[PDB]
Design a protein around this ligand. Sequence first.
Ligand SMILES: [Mg+2]
Ligand SMILES: [Mn+2]
Length: 196
Amino acid sequence: SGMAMEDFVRQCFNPMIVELAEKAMKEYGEDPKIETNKFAAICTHLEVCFMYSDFHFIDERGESIIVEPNALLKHRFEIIEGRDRIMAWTVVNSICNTTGVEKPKFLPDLYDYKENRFIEIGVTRREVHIYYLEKANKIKSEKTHIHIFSFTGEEMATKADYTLDEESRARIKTRLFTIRQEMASRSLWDSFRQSE
Ligand SMILES: [Mg+2]
Ligand SMILES: [Mn+2]
């Protein structure tokens, strides 16, 4: 049964994440009570996208600052993940009008208004490098920047450009590490790793 992992997921992630995850799975006919490892991989991916975006703003004078919220500040990242297909492409289409950036052929996860590129995010239970290569092959738009995180504290990003400050990236790598430890303590980790 997947009861054990389903309960872990529901206490590990905040309720906004769990709802988004259940919405996405219902939409394409997947049931979180049954595909419990998938349930977890979706929440994790969601939690990473939101963290990546946390605290990053461009201000009135137009430069990217860190804030841990003041009305003339614009969010540094647009978030594309978490939306249904129509809305996602609506946001991407609006973004290509705003900036004039080439429209990508697949939906990526974020848009970065400072570097002016889309970001495809990846979270893997395998090794960071091979995952990166498999993603770069599959996208094959030199357009879209790729940033990969692992549960062992590692990352790999296009051109060795890690986009964010080290402190922000450490915050994400520490979160994934803690999730894996928590899973491993309950002997849920090997099943979640193996299902990838
Ligand atoms: Mg995505
Ligand atoms: Mn992604």
